RNA sequence: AUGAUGUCAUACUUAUCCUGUCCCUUUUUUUUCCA
């Protein structure tokens, strides 16, 4: 619908129409806008082709069913890490178990 | 005066010209030989009806084409307005529906054709820019889940008319020039000096006695603009009484009183009628523009000014150039127009700066982020710098995300694709800012409304031609006071502007030179030397210049022309020299075209010339499609050199039927291609006069390379073990990276350019035989030197 | 194109080799070619036709 | 069988062709009717002067077109159509407006042409897609 | 079929028959001629490449040579009258048309090598 | 064709994503991919030559991937022909899908 | 019984190199019988 209206009222679809639904959808709507849409409008049969790679490479793919450039990126587990820390106790409870205090590093934000 | 010696010569010029053309047609009627029962007759009368019928088929459908077009061409400007009656009304219904019926009863047949070749056909063994909308319905198909007012116009025109800086200055300026034949009229842009003035003249009747009023411009597109504008004012059709004549496009009629043109166009009108006796007035606009054609017209028209006092000299320009203007022109009075719409706050940096391109970047950054609404204009030097700029700007856009607003970076220069030129002309999408990165192409003749900020890093890339080396180098150059003032003046045209100079008041007021060197000094003049010796003024020294070239420059010109064979050993005109001089193209090229006569490679040498006319923009080389681009280029790469490369490229384009999508597929600038085609076609229209027989080399590129030599023998280098070095001066050159021979690196080299960019360079190069050099120029090239 | 048909069909008929045993493929298909997706799905189209019939 | 099938394909093809051909011509005859009655329905205070303007304009147009083709073989094809394709020209000529486009804060927020799944590799650390803090 | 399987010659001949039929029906479509393609009189030559100074009298002179003329009609640019540099010329006999043709093709008169072909006019 | 060949070669490098100790033969295949990435027209010339004249190919090696419950054959083809087939793969699938060869019930399809 | 001719790869020499290299600003030039 918004694409029709952008043609009819002839506007440009602005960031405000698509920041709400920006990783939603299945392909994903943020694949419309990637860098290489131009040469990926030419990759057809990619799904069969990743199925059949199993007779060509000696290793076994666990994401044979999908493609990140084509299907989008369909899971986001960035909060797993945050809640894992809060459940183990927080960075302080977590580094009472380690050799951190024997390094004499003054604080743990820099650790690298 | 020398004016009278001139017109003496020039009337005899027209006499001998007409008699020459008449002689030649007689020659051709000589060369050309054209000399011219019962059942025989009743046999071929069926065959004469055969041809009558078929030529009549094409002829009848052709006449249908004529009246077909004419119905709508007629209903364009009569019907949709006026209270018109039964007869032509009914016949509009008629011609409407009837050309529909023609298109329809032919679209039927074509439908048959395409539908019946849609089908399946067992194979037989015998030994437009939408790749991003064909990938945007891949996604919407993968993601589907279904189970009077013309008088009012005139009022508005006059109402705006009245508010010019010249409308209240109307009368006294009229009376003033009624006094003085030569009146210098200083006024800045937007005053209307180009538009309102010739109107005033016409309504005051200087066109009476059938006379004309010339307006010259240095730029075609600007002339077309001006002409559209004043024809709209005058309430007539552009082309009949107000007209513009530019190369390849006449827009005049014998109703034309107000005729607009170029400076070379007016010189060429002196190639038609030395007196301009049908013109009462010549108004020369913006003469400050400093072209060779401006600096020739100045002399010629000053002669005419002394010789024709009933004739009128008007020379208007932008800047303080009135001092030398009047002084050369016997100190004509100077009528001052005050014209400057809105103010500019012009700022200087605190200091001098080290990294001025980056400084550009961070400037526009701050401006955009903090400022109120308003569009921005930024200058750079040119292409590579400018895309690097948009690189940086859009990268910081990437990083700063929704923290900022939409920054329409648009580059603009001369060679970039014309769709990409136009893209800047759209009205800005509400709420976003538009920043145009530009070159000094945006000094002049391009009108971008909305620009409220202007940034000058205070530079330019000027050509500099030293003749002692034959070298013209397009190098960096701090830009003049006139430049900075006018680059700034580009602003303000609708509102208060700002002009950020990347340099201080100190450097500005103190080390700023007023004007770019009037062109004739700095440029190479081969064709204008050719021109004034085509007009025959034997003393080329005491001629009435505005600024003479260095005697050095002229000496080089003379040696150039003599060696090439346009000059005798005393410096006058051969038939070679004249025949080449009629060509509006360089003598080297001209010698090559004449060489096609000897080598029977007419067509191929023609198309080559057509290419070198415009080359500088042939192949689009985008960063975002570098490899496919290099590829659609590397396709044509022929053995022999860039010139025959161009030959095949044009050949294949026209082969495709002058297809635009052809060049779009094959990474070629359609602009370059089609203007080059036009220059070749008008070259062919010259070709009868220059007496060239239309011949093919029959695939023998040896003739091609040899005619190339017979033209460009001067433009040659040889292998040295310390690099590629000249044939004559043994100064050291290098090959352009993008040469079709760049890795081939031939022993005996011909070029077409001689520049010294970051290192000495040469362009449009080819591999030659040193033997053709003793074939062609044993008087200039001796054997021992090869 | 009969050229491409012949390339594909002659490329399925190769010598297949393991440590020291060699034989020549003549009957089936090497599924480790890169167009073998295409060949399998085209053949499967023909057998969809034998199962459904042309009308359905 | 391949020869036989080639023949039957071609014969069926030209049969169906000829059928649709004849039908097209019948369509065309109805359009012949359309044209005759078109001019018939046609034939029966600005128009009289706009009408002298009709023949004035059209006839001097034929003058210029004939004279074009006569000075140069098709100087009509060398003037009038070639007037109207080049861009600076059109912009100076004030011709107006001679698809969806949208904001550029949208584009190029991701660059690459390969799936990030590394082609079946596993041992590399690509779980989350944002450095921790 | 058999409007195709006869030759290649008469094949394209039938297609040229067509091209005629379609161009006729087309020209009547856009509406010039009242009656459809009535055969043109064998007794007028259309003579182009002409001079605006050769008139009905002089052309009827030189084409009085081969046959009895019925007229000489240089069509006029109406409101200025300037000769259209072509003409129609009207004979009494087929033989008169032919005899004028076969000597007057591409001849130089008034320094112009005019062209004569028969009239294609249904006008 | 350069879009189709760029897709081919991206697909082929995905095998050696990690850039391990691979071997002689994988080093040589990576060399071929890079040189045909640099000069994309020597490549396409070579390809269309193969496709036009060749009908006797080298020999392929076999081995098995053990999935503990059954085995899978894995075929090893020579890198030159691997490149010509990668290209032919992409080309046939692009054209077949544009001409609509495969009707919609043939289903490892790219849409879901 | 040692000729030059070479599009021959290999061997070899100079405490001979691994640090001596790269993409154009602006723009203009008169024209001719149609058939």
Cite the beta strand spans of B173-328 per DSSP E. Answer: 182-186, 212-217, 242-246, 249-251, 258-262, 279-284, 312-317
At B543, is the secondary structure helix, strand, or coil? coil
Q: How far apart are CA F23 and CA F12, in angstroms?
A: 16
Closest CA to A13 of D108, B401, B431, D102: D102
Q: Do chains E and A touch (3 or more CB pairs under 8 A)?
A: no
Q: Nearest to residue B435, comparing CAs of B459, B412, B401?
A: B412
Tokens (6 digits) for B623: 């960063």
- Given CA atoms B538, B540, B541, B546 in this order, what sign does their dihedral have? positive
Where b means 16+ CB within 10 Å and e means fewer, E69-105 reads beebebeebeeeeebebebbbbbeeeebbbbbbeebb
* CB contact at 8 A, B460 and B477: yes
Structural contact between residues B449 and B460, judged by C-beta atoms closer than 8 angstroms: no
Q: Give, in Å, how far the C1' of G27 lies from the CA of B263.
A: 11
Task: Centre a 10 Å sphere on the Cβ of residue B742 and count the other Cβ atoms it contains.
Answer: 13
> Which residues contact residue B298 at a Cβ distance below 8 angstroms, ignoring those fewer than 6 apart?
B287, B328, B329, B546
**CB-based contacts of F104: which residues, under 8 Å, 6+ apart?**
none
Parallel, antiparallel or unpaired: strands B433-438 and B375-379: parallel
- Polymer length of chain F: 112
Q: Are B631 and F41 an interchain contact pair (Cβ–Cβ within 8 Å)?
A: yes
Q: Give the whole-angstrom CA distance, residue B131 versus residue A42.
A: 9
* Residues B609/B593, Cβ–Cβ less than 8 Å: yes
> HEC string of B636-671?
CCCCCEHHHHHHHHHHHHHHCCCCHHHHHHCCCCHH
Q: Are B345 and B239 in contact (CB under 8 A)?
A: no
Question: CA of C37 to nearest chain A CA: how many angstroms apart?
Answer: 6
Encode burial over C8-20: b for 16+ CB neighbours within 10 A, e otherwise. beebbebebeeee
Residues B587, B593: Cα–Cα separation, whole Å = 9
Gyration radius of chain E over CA positions: 18
Rg of chain C over all Cα atoms, to the nearest angstrom: 15
Looking at B477-589, which runs of residues are DSSP E strands?
497-501
**Technique used:** cryo-EM
Closest CA to E40 of B52, B63, B47: B52
CA distances for B590 relative to B585, B594, B683, B709, angstroms: 7, 6, 11, 12
Cα separation of B385 and B387, whole Å?
A: 6
Q: What is the DSSP string of B419-448?
A: HHHHGGGSPPPTT-EEEEEE-GGGTSS---
Residue F70 CA to residue B612 CA, distance in Å, equals 70
Name beta bridge partners: B315: B184, B284
Chain B 568-597, CB < 7 Å to strand G: 582-584
What's the per-residue H, E or C state across B77-145? CCCCCCCCCHHHHHHHHHHHHHHHHHHHHHHHHHHHHHHHCCCCCCCCCCCCCCCCCCCCCHHHHHCCC
C-alpha of B246 from chain center: 10
D83 token code pair: 């007037």
Q: CA dihedral in degrees (A15, A18, A23, A24; nearest 10)?
A: 180
Residue B225: exposed, middle, or buried by beta-carbon count in 10 A (0-12, 13-18, 19+)? buried
Which H or E element spans position E108?
A: strand E108-109
What whole-number distance in Å separates Cα of residue D114 and Cα of residue D116?
6
Which nucleotide lies at the shortest CA–C1' distance from B62?
A: G35
Nearest-10 crossing angle of helices B2-31, B292-307 = 110
Extract the tokens encoding B151: 């008088």
Collect all residues with Cβ–Cβ distance below 8 Å to B565 and sequence separation of at least 6.
B574, B576, B577, B591
How buried is B42 (Cβ within 10 angstroms: 0-12 exposed, 13-18 middle, 19+ buried)? exposed
Q: Could you tell me if residue B754 is left (phi over 0), alpha (psi between -120 and 50 degrees) or otherwise beta?
A: beta
Judged by DSSP in three states, C36 sits in: helix
Paired residues of B748 in beta bridges: B718
Strand B407-412 with B433-438, pairing: parallel
Look up residue A85 and give its two tokens.
């820390």
DSSP state at residue E7: B
* Backbone phi and psi for residue A92, each to the nearest 5 degrees, phi listed first: -80, -50
Q: State how far residue F16 is from chain B, nearest Cα, in angstroms.
A: 23
Q: Which residues does F45 contact at the CB level (< 8 Å), separation at least 6?
A: none
| Beta carbons of B415 and B475 less than 8 angstroms apart | no
User: Is B6:B302 a contact under the CB 8 Å cutoff?
Assistant: no
Report the alpha-carbon distance of residue A46 to residue B512 in Å, rounded. Answer: 63
Chain F nearest C-alpha distance from D44 (Å): 53
- Let me know if chains E and F touch, i.e. at least 3 Cβ pairs under 8 angstroms: no
Mutating which of D24, D33, D59, D68 best tests the E interface, going by the most E Cβ atoms within 10 A?
D59
- Please answer whether residues B437 and B412 qualify as being in contact, where contact means their C-beta atoms are separated by less than 8 angstroms: yes
**Could you tell me which residues come within 8 angstroms of residue B365 by beta carbon, excluding any fewer than 6 positions away?**
B393, B396
Asked if B588 contacts B526 with a C-beta cutoff of 8 angstroms, the reply is: yes
Spatial separation of the C-alpha atoms in residues B696 and B278, rounded to whole Å:
44
**List of chains touching A (3+ CB pairs within 8 A):** B, C, D, F
On whether any CB of chain D is under 8 Å from the CB of A15, the answer is: yes
Select the residue of E1, E31, E84 nearest D35 (Cβ to Cβ).
E31
H helix runs in B234-343, sequence order: 263-269, 292-307, 322-328
CA–CA gap between residue F26 and residue F20 (Å, rounded): 10
Q: What is the separation, in whole angstroms, between the first and last Cα of chain A?
A: 48
Q: What 8-state DSSP symbol labels residue D74?
A: T
d(C-alpha B293, C-alpha B289), whole Å: 10
Structure tokens at B239: 């082309």
Residues belonging to the binding site of B are 187-194
The residue written with tokens 């759209």 in the block is B426
- Cα–Cα distance measured from residue B87 to residue B221, given in angstroms and rounded to the nearest whole number: 42
Question: Which residues, other chains included, contact D45 with Cβ-Cβ below 8 Å and sequence gap of 6+?
Answer: B83, B85
CB atoms F94 and A42 under 8 Å: yes
Nearest chain D residue to E26, by CA: D32
The C-alpha angle with vertex D74 and arms to D72 and D75, in degrees rounded to 5, equals 60
| Residue F4 and residue F94 in contact, taking contact as beta carbons nearer than 8 Å | yes
Residue B776, number of CB atoms within 10 A of its CB: 19
Chains near E, with 3+ CB pairs < 8 A? B, D
* Residue reference for tokens 């028959």: E17
Contact present, B759 and B740 (Cβ < 8 Å): no
Give the list of residues 6+ apart from residue C39 with CB closer than 8 angstroms, or none. Answer: C8, C29
- What is the DSSP secondary structure assignment for residue B567, as one 8-state letter? B
Q: What is the DSSP letter of E80?
A: T
Contact list in A for residue F89 (CB cut-off 8 A) is: 45, 49
Q: Looking at the DSSP assignment, which residues form a beta bridge with residue B435?
A: B376, B409
Task: Give the chain F residue whose CA is nearest to the CA of B140.
Answer: F111
Chain G nucleotides near the protein (CB, 7 A): 21-35
């Amino acid at each position: 619908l918004k694409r029709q209206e952008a043609i009819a009222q002839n506007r440009r679809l602005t960031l405000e129409d698509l920041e709400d639904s920006w990783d939603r959808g299945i392909p994903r709507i943020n694949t419309l806008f990637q860098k290489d849409r131009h040469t990926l409008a030419y990759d057809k049969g990619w799904r069969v082709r990743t199925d059949f790679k199993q007779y060509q490479v000696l290793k076994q793919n666990p994401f044979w069913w999908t493609h990140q450039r084509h299907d989008g990126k369909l899971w986001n587990l960035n909060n797993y890490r945050t809640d894992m820390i809060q459940a183990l106790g927080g960075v302080e409870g977590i580094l009472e178990h380690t050799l951190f205090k024997g390094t004499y590093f003054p604080t743990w934000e820099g650790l690298f | 005066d020398e004016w009278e010696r001139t017109e003496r010569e020039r009337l005899q010029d027209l006499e001998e010209r007409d008699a020459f053309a008449e002689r030649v047609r007689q020659r051709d009627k000589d060369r050309t030989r054209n000399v011219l029962a019962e059942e025989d007759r009743k046999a071929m009368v069926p065959e004469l009806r055969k041809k009558s019928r078929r030529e009549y088929l094409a002829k009848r459908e052709r006449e249908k084409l004529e009246d077909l077009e004419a119905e709508l061409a007629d209903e364009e400007f009569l019907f949709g307005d006026v209270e018109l009656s039964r007869h032509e009304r009914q016949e509009l219904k008629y011609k409407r529906r009837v050309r529909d019926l023609a298109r329809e009863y032919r679209a039927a047949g074509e439908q048959e054709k395409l539908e019946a070749t849609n089908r399946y056909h067992m194979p037989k063994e015998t030994r437009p820019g939408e790749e991003q909308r064909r990938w945007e319905e891949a996604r919407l198909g993968a993601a589907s889940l279904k189970f009077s007012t013309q008088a009012q116009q005139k009022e508005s025109i006059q109402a705006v008319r009245r508010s010019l800086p010249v409308f209240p200055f109307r009368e006294e300026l009229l009376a003033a020039i009624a006094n003085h034949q030569v009146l210098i009229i200083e006024g800045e842009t937007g005053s209307g000096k180009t538009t309102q003035i010739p109107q005033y003249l016409f309504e005051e009747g200087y066109t009476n006695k059938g006379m004309k009023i010339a307006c010259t411009q240095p730029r075609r597109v600007a002339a077309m603009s001006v002409a559209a504008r004043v024809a709209r004012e005058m309430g007539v059709k552009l082309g009949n009484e107000v007209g513009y004549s530019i190369r390849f496009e006449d827009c005049t009629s014998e109703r034309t009183v107000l005729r607009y043109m170029t400076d070379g166009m007016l010189l060429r009108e002196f190639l038609s009628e030395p007196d301009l006796a049908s013109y009462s007035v010549v108004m020369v606009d913006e003469a400050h523009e400093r072209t060779l054609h401006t600096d020739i017209l100045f002399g010629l028209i000053k002669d005419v000014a002394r010789f024709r006092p009933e004739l009128k000299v008007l020379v208007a320009s932008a800047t303080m150039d009135t001092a030398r203007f009047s002084t050369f022109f016997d100190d004509a009075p100077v009528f001052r127009i005050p014209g400057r719409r809105f103010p500019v706050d012009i700022f200087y940096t605190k200091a001098p700066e080290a990294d001025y391109l980056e400084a550009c970047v961070v400037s526009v950054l701050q401006i955009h982020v903090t400022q109120p609404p308003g569009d921005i204009l930024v200058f750079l030097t040119g292409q590579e710098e400018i895309e690097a700029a948009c690189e940086m700007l859009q990268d910081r856009c990437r990083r700063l995300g929704s923290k900022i607003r939409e920054l329409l970076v648009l580059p603009i220069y001369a060679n970039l694709p014309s769709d990409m030129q136009a893209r800047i002309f759209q009205p800005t999408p509400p709420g976003a800012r538009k920043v145009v990165v530009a070159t000094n192409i945006a000094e002049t003749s391009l009108t971008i409304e909305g620009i409220i900020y202007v940034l000058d890093p205070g530079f330019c890339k000027q050509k500099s031609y030293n003749p002692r080396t034959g070298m013209e180098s397009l190098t960096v150059t701090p830009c003049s006071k006139a430049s900075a003032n006018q680059r700034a003046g580009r602003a303000g045209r609708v509102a208060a502007g700002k002009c950020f100079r990347l340099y201080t008041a100190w450097a500005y007021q103190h080390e700023l030179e007023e004007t770019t060197v009037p062109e004739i000094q700095r440029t190479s003049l081969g064709n204008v030397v050719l021109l004034l010796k085509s007009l025959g003024i034997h003393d080329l020294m005491h001629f009435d210049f505005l600024d003479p070239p260095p005697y050095e420059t002229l000496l080089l010109a003379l040696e150039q022309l003599y060696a090439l064979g346009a000059l005798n050993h005393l410096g006058e005109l051969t038939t070679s020299g004249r025949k080449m001089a009629e060509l509006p193209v360089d003598p080297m090229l001209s010698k090559m075209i004449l060489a096609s006569e000897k080598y029977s490679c007419s067509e191929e040498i023609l198309t080559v010339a057509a290419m070198l006319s415009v080359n500088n923009s042939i192949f689009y080389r985008p960063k975002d499609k570098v490899v496919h681009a290099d590829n659609a280029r590397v396709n044509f790469f022929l053995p022999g050199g860039d010139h025959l490369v161009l030959l095949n490229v044009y050949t294949q384009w026209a082969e495709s039927g002058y297809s635009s999508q052809w060049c779009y597929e094959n990474f070629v600038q359609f602009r370059s291609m089609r203007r080059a085609r036009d220059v070749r076609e008008q070259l062919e229209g010259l070709l009868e006069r220059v007496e060239v027989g239309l011949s093919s080399c029959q695939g023998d590129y040896i003739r091609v390379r040899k005619a190339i030599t017979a033209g460009y023998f001067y433009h040659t280098a040889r292998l040295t073990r310390s690099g590629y070095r000249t044939v004559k001066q043994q100064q050291t050159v290098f090959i352009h990276p993008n040469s079709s021979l760049f890795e081939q690196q031939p022993r005996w080299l011909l070029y077409h350019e001689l520049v010294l960019t970051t290192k000495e360079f040469m362009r449009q190069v080819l591999e030659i035989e040193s033997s053709w050099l003793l074939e062609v120029a044993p008087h200039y090239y001796k054997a021992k030197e090869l | 194109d009969h050229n491409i048909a012949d390339y594909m069909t002659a490329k399925n008929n190769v010598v297949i080799n393991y440590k020291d045993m060699n034989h020549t493929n003549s009957y089936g298909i090497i599924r480790g070619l890169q167009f073998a997706s295409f060949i399998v799905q085209y053949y499967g189209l023909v057998m969809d036709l034998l199962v459904l019939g042309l009308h359905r | 069988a391949d020869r036989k099938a080639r023949e039957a394909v071609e014969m069926r093809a030209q049969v169906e062709r000829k059928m649709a051909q004849k039908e097209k011509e019948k369509h065309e005859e109805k359009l012949r009717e359309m044209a005759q009655k078109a001019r018939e329905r046609r034939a029966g205070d600005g128009e009289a002067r706009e009408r002298d303007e009709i023949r004035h304009d059209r006839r001097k147009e034929r003058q210029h077109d004939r004279n074009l083709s006569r000075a140069a073989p098709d100087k009509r094809s060398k003037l009038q159509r070639n007037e109207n394709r080049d861009i600076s020209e059109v912009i100076a000529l004030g011709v107006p407006n001679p698809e969806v486009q949208y904001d550029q804060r949208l584009f190029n927020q991701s660059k690459g042409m390969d799936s990030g799944f590394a082609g079946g590799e596993d041992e590399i650390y690509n779980v989350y897609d944002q450095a921790w803090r | 079929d058999d409007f195709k399987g006869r030759s290649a010659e008469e094949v394209e001949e039938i297609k040229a028959e067509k091209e005629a039929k379609t161009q006729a029906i087309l020209l009547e479509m856009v509406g010039d001629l009242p009656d459809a393609d009535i055969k043109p009189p064998e007794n007028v030559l259309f003579v182009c490449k002409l001079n605006p100074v050769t008139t009905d009298e002089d052309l009827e002179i030189i084409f009085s040579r081969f046959g009895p003329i019925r007229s000489c009609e240089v069509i006029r640019d109406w409101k200025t009258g300037e000769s259209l540099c072509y003409a129609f010329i009207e004979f009494e006999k087929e033989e008169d048309c032919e005899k004028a043709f076969f000597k007057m093709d591409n001849v130089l008169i008034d320094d112009r090598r005019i062209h004569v072909d028969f009239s294609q006019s249904v006008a | 064709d350069t879009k189709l060949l760029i897709l081919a070669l991206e697909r082929l490098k995905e095998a050696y994503s990690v850039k391990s100790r691979l071997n002689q033969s994988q080093r040589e295949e990576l060399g071929l991919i890079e040189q045909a990435y640099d000069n994309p027209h020597e490549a396409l010339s070579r390809i269309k030559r193969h496709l036009l004249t060749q009908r006797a190919f080298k020999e392929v090696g076999i081995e098995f991937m053990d999935l503990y419950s059954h085995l899978v054959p894995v075929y090893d083809v020579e890198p030159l022909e691997k490149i010509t087939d990668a290209y032919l793969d992409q080309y046939l699938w692009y054209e077949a899908d544009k001409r609509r060869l495969f009707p919609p019930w043939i289903k490892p399809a790219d849409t879901e």
